[PDB]
């Protein structure tokens, strides 16, 4: 959890996501509702969104739960593809679900999808936030990273790697969070770190 130090979440292979606390030997809460493999999930950052969880599954569903009522999902969005990646935006309002050959920005304030953005050929694997919470870098099985703006969501820049990439993150330096270097982990078994120093 981004705020508490002992709370963590788990999306397992069967149907479950569940909340654990580090001192206890039991999962504190259990959330079911998915029908296939659930394989990507995150907490929701925000002052108002203290305990909400998003996870997308391989059943082409993104579900966001309140942790106060362990019934079903609070909101559910059905896609067309097996949903590979999920990240919320740092304002806590919108959310990017990466499913197949397209990512999708969805609102959580009024439960309505904004926009489907298709700019990859093969299936997008991993999303990451960038420079100051302003630019989303997405990496696909096409060998492509592509960085989009967050206001209009246009393809601002991109690059191509010699292998289909599986994980991608730009990571930050320290105070004020200037991004140090971008690392891509590829199917070939290589971590390519590209460093920028200012």
């Amino acid at each position: 959890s981004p705020t508490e130090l002992t709370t963590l979440m788990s999306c397992s292979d069967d149907k479950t996501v569940r909340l654990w606390d580090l001192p206890s030997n039991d999962p504190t809460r259990l959330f079911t509702g998915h029908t296939d493999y659930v394989r990507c999930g995150a907490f929701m950052p925000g002052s108002a969104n203290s305990n909400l969880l998003v996870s997308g599954s391989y059943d082409e569903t993104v579900r966001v739960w309140d942790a106060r009522a362990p019934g079903g999902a609070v909101m559910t969005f059905k896609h067309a593809d097996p949903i590979e990646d999920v990240l919320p935006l740092p304002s806590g309002t919108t959310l990017l679900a990466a499913s197949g050959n397209a990512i999708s920005v969805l609102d959580l304030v009024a439960a309505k999808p904004l926009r489907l953005i298709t700019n990859h050929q093969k299936t997008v694997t991993s999303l990451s936030l960038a420079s100051q919470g302003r630019r989303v870098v997405s990496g696909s099985l096409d060998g492509h990273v592509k960085v989009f703006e967050t206001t209009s969501w246009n393809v601002v820049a991109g690059a191509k790697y010699p292998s289909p990439i599986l994980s991608l993150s730009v990571i930050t330096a320290g105070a004020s969070h200037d991004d140090r270097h971008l690392a891509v982990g590829m199917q070939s078994g290589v971590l390519s770190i590209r460093t920028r120093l200012s």
Partner: protein
């Protein structure tokens, strides 16, 4: 929706010279399981065959597995 699982089948029992049971442990802790092979002996075998101590058993190719089964037959042909 197609990532190569050409390496993900490794935690299975491998067969070798005498023992029919040799699973994944490491590369030098798997050599101790063969009878007559020691804990100080198993490190000498790995430094000749250019296999790394970091890898496991089962992370080796069909060529690299048999290179340790020739050199376990004749310890005199490779210098000692």
């Amino acid at each position: 929706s197609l990532v190569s699982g050409e390496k993900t089948n490794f935690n299975h029992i491998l067969r070798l010279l005498n023992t029919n049971v040799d699973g994944k442990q490491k590369v030098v802790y798997a050599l101790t399981q063969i009878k007559g092979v020691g804990r100080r002996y198993s490190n000498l075998v790995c430094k000749k065959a250019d296999v790394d101590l970091k890898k496991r058993a089962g992370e080796l190719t069909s060529e690299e597995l048999e290179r340790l089964v020739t050199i376990i037959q004749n310890p005199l042909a490779y210098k000692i």
